[PDB]
Symmetry: D2
Amino acid sequence: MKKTKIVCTIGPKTESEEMLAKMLDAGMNVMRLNFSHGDYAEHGQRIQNLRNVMSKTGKTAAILLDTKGPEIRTMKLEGGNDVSLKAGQTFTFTTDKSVIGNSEMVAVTYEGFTTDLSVGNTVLVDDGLIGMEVTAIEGNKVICKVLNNGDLGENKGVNLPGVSIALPALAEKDKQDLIFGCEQGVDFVAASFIRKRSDVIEIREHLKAHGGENIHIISKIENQEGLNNFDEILEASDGIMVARGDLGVEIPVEEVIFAQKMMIEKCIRARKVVITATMRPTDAEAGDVANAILDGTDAVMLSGEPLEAVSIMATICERTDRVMNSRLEITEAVCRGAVETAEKLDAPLIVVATQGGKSARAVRKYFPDATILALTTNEKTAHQLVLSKGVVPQLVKEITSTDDFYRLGKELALQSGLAHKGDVVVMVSGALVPSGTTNTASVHVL
Amino acid sequence: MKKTKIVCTIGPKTESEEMLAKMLDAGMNVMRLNFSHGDYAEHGQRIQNLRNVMSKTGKTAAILLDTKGPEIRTMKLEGGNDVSLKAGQTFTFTTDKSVIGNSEMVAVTYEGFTTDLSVGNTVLVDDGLIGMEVTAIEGNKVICKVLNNGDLGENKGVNLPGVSIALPALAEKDKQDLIFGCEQGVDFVAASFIRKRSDVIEIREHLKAHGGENIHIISKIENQEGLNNFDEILEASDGIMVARGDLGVEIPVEEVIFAQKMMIEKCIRARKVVITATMRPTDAEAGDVANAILDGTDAVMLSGEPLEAVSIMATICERTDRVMNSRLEITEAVCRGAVETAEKLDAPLIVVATQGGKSARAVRKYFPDATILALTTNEKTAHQLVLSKGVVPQLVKEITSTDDFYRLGKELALQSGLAHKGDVVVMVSGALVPSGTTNTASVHVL
Amino acid sequence: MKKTKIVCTIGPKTESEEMLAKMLDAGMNVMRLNFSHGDYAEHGQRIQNLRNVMSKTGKTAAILLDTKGPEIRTMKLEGGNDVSLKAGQTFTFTTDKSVIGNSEMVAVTYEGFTTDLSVGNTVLVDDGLIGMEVTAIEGNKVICKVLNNGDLGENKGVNLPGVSIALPALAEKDKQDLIFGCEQGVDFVAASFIRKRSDVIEIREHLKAHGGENIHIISKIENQEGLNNFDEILEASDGIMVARGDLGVEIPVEEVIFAQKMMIEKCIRARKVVITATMRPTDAEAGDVANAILDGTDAVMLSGEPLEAVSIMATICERTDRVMNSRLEITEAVCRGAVETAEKLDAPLIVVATQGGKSARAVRKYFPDATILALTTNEKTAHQLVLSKGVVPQLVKEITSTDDFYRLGKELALQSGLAHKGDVVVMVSGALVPSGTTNTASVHVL
Amino acid sequence: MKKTKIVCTIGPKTESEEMLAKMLDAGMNVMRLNFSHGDYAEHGQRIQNLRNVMSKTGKTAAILLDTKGPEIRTMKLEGGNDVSLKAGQTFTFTTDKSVIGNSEMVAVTYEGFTTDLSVGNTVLVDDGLIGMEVTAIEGNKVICKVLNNGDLGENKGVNLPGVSIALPALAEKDKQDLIFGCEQGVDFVAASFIRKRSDVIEIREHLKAHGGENIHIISKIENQEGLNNFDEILEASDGIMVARGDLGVEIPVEEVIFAQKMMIEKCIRARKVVITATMRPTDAEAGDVANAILDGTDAVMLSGEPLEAVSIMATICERTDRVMNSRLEITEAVCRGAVETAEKLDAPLIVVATQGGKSARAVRKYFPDATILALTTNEKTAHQLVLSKGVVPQLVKEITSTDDFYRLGKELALQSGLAHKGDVVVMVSGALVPSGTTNTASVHVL
């Protein structure tokens, strides 16, 4: 079986339960829900359908609701026709939504545009297709020198590298989508356009205000600022999502692959999950994936793409997984040890008891060869760990004591078909210490 | 300065001595001549302008002559019109070149088609565009079930994956371009579609028969059969060219990045050069490269693409090189040592004497942080060294003995601007041993 | 505190409970009863006075009954006067007990003297004071040339180096002292002159007929035959005792220090005990001790030597102990694990539960810096662990489970004064597995 | 052959040319001349017969002058009679030489006896045979309590543990002996009772005023103050000597084996020689030596002991060296490399060119398995190296260049019988660098 997890974004062509069940077989592990479109009626059904499939089949799966996030946008162009901007010429951005663009100027969805900006700064239109330096700003007008030739189409995204934009972590709508997440009880929330440590707090603050406390926050890094603040942001988050394309528009090309690498390394050390979103696939892509997985990503995600797409990502996840190796060089010490020994003894698995899922995470850090079977009485947690690499969670009634665990665990591991009589198996867990503390390890033959 | 070498394909837009002198400043290291087009006069001019540039500036550069190689193709279609192939329908291939194609059948340029093929096999037309399984074969006819919908144009490329194709090794025109090589005295010849050790032999054999004894043969791996005989192919070749696309059409997507990976590894171990040929650039590509560099390729190529392309590829070469590490875990011992010590002492350079260039290869296999400065009396060897990672060759008049070598080397090293007063410097070379044997290292302060 | 355990041979001048108490203060851990002298009343008393100081102060210590064993001896001399033997002269030994020696001949206590011997063999008189080569053998006489000048006193000890002597495993008296040992419940019996595996089985077999089943048998290695079968002897014993002087008589001087070194390593890896008997002490001696510790002996030994001797031995034991280091390169896994982590985390101690003493041992093998505190409900086992390096037993009423164990252990760890609040502490023990299997480790802060 | 060097102190019973050469055949490697006795005529003869033997057999051997050194001593007793001292009694020392002692008092040779001492101090008489506590000092007398019962004979040597005795570095006849050693050209002078760096300097100045510049100074560490300044004394000397017995009298017992262990370690690392002087032999001793070897001493010394002594000494050296192993974890890199490389390739020997003997030294530090063959034109140097571990020196005419060296060393190696056709051999040397610098290495097949 593969170990890497796959995240698909679901939609119309794929929301039926019959579709979802097949997608589960193809390899999907989490259902993404993009708040950039659709509605509460649809999404809620989408979600319902997944859960019915789960009940009907014993299959497990997480649900992640993806935030739209703040966004600046260029408006309307005369007769809806693309205009061509010439280098060195003048070009003007406006705050007035009424205004119909053309080759002389254009309106932006962002009222705060005039403010945050400054002459000297760089503006970047439509996925950085066109750069410009702000020469002037007066009233609702942003006046600039185009730095290079290009076609300005309508509704193009704007980027201001380096500038801190005063929009909120939370769009107005962004707040409503969250509540829906909590009411629905989504497992994760991938927050968009996160630039500094505060952005994570505000969503945590927000989710807490609506019963969302046990929801993991996956911060989406998408720019020079979030990149600079990554440590802080990673600190505050429950996970991370490397938005390659998005980030690619805001910084040097030779940096992207690296950023993705530093982010993943940092997440791994940190015990936090990381989703990598890159661009049959073109080979550039099939190796871009494999590389993300070699870099050690927990999960790869699939976007607007579908049953064949799944299976290919799924035969790629397996092929790259089957050749990776552990990375051995208190919870740490126990966990590393578990793994190592796991490996020395040739244990096919490593059962683990986790309430909040931390120990499965801590174990999964060393890239074990064995599958982690994680035990839990907590349902959100059982759902969440579906995101994490090599983990295979199992909700359980209870675990009375360390010895009960070992006993139970052995019954379970044997039921999983993941192990057999004579198999040695390593058990990791807590013993006389609060949650959030892994500290006991134990070998056992099935 | 980078250390990964760049290989650019030159053309009309890039042939003047003024452009070529620019491209060298941009990072180019080896001119590729693609025998796929052009003519002897142009190419020869192209080569002359490079050499002029060389004399003029003292800049060095090598010269690869890349081969067109053999192929299986589809012929003529009625009216010269594209036919529409429907899935599951029958479609027959014919050995008889006189036959004019249509929706029901088409003739291939390959007489052995019937022979090498066999029921069950997959036939792939126009770059993988359309696939077909072989149902029957009889007379000059290959009967097939068409696997998927597509349009058949004329002169389309055929590929029969897995199959051992009985075509010859060199094209007839191939034979002619090689001689021109041997007359113009190019540094390397990259053979095309190399499937088994003998194909390598045939080129060597041809090259010797016309003054080409010292030309290195870099072999292009483009399919399953070459892939499977890699060891022997590598053995007999002087180096290798990872042809990603071509490979991408012949075997599973999830394999390609792994084929490249195993190629580079085995090359480096083998002391031979490997050039990476992958698909401002889409991020996928900008990483694809870096990854190739990280996996350890000596050089990366640039095709039909131009002065900015080179520069970028440079910045990508310098940026990925600046963070790799040596890889330390008789010629070998000496060489390895030379490197670790080079490193212990903080040596900015490792002067090396080479006739055939093997010693410099030997040093480089360890991925030195230091630049390898190479001394040679042999010009072909000096040019070819350009294709090597981190190596900086220098033609020198002579070296009378181990001690002359040390003294000269010191002089040279200081002249290079590469090292200075107080810099330690390691110096490998042969001593009382035939060429092909390295065995002496000596540390020195400038 | 030192971790190496010191063994004391008790006698008249040191048997008072008063004396013993002071001896235990100075460092003594074991009471050695040399069966080569004294009588069942005196030993018994010696035993009881110890057991008394034990009850009276909670101290712990064990008692080893050292066997006299079989031996060959010269007998009576005319007028009981010492005869001077001249080099090269003739001298003969006889089997006939009635015969009274003189300068030409002497009888031996050993009837198999003629039979096991052989012309050319070396015969060693009185702690090798005089050597002699066997020149002839006829009837009950063994005719020999004298190799060196010396006086033969009566009742002299005989050594046939290299010879395989057929004496039995146990003297008739030996079987008698063994029973008393059983009656008295000593901890260990150090068997004398062990030659081959059968010797050990006889001893073991005899103790079981005596209720001595849980008595550890320690093999005394005194000659080449014993040294040859070491591995098989060690396998059947519970531990070994390196009898230096005795070995010195029986084999090449250059071999003894290395035979010692070999026996200790093998015994370590075997998880079995080894007591070191070497020859204020002479620096030679002082060093000789230090080195047995460096070689890693669990325990050293003091003979006919008394309070100052125990103390010094001890200041040397601590001196050497304080600079040793662990030795890290199922039970093994866990135990190796446990110590390493113990060391990583600064654990000043390693609690361990043991019935049989096995895991305390297992842990021990790694030469931990932390003290091993061993909890056991078995007192025999608690006594025997006194013999083990760095281990410190504690008898406990019971442990109901792994968790009961942990809670209990931390109470006891803190009470020991051996550890404090904030201190980290490793705990090993079995979980769901029979005795003889260690398999679980857990870290805990006091 | 053994690699460890042996030092034999020579005497009447061993000064004959017939006796010496037998000794060299027994294993002797340096002749120790003890200036504690004898005269200029005898010792010189003693060196004569040695040099002669060398001439007549081509055997090499070095010669060490050993210093008597300054001292404090007790004097004359009434009637030249021994007095018995009873414990707790009073006893007094006096700085007055006229006074003839008795059971109440005895004068000392050392005028600073009062000044350097202090109440509470321990005074050891006649090789520590009798301890005494200083209770008072007034005028020229040192009042003390006898610590134990014993007989005081005349002219007994005194030791003041821990005290810093202000005697000079050189006893007045010590300078004379030094001039004899210069005139006689000895290889090494072993200085006595070295306490601090300045003592080592004084002697270096004394040999220099007499053409002694090439004689290596081996400082003998006898007590606590010198053990303290060892780092600085090691620095200023050419090697050291661990005078166990004298150390054994001056500091705690558990401390000596460690002091010897620290000295040897710091010696090895410093590329300096160390002679270990420990107490058929008693096991203790035969193991004591082996341990010095295992600790890594260059050489072991023989004292007032003779042909069988050397033999056994040697057979132990072989039995020990045959089981030691290299110790691999500028000159340093090159030499470590050389060794390591030497070992990887299986070289039986490592030729080294040396003037000053240094590189023979740097190479040996690593504990090579291969014999070092050192080539030199300096005969002092060649004699000196005999003292060095595993080195085999050779005087040679000249070496014109690095290449000649290689050519020469290759003939020599094969001639030595130490290697053969097909054997690889690693050669080190200097190259374009003043003496004191090693920096070249080169592998060769014989």
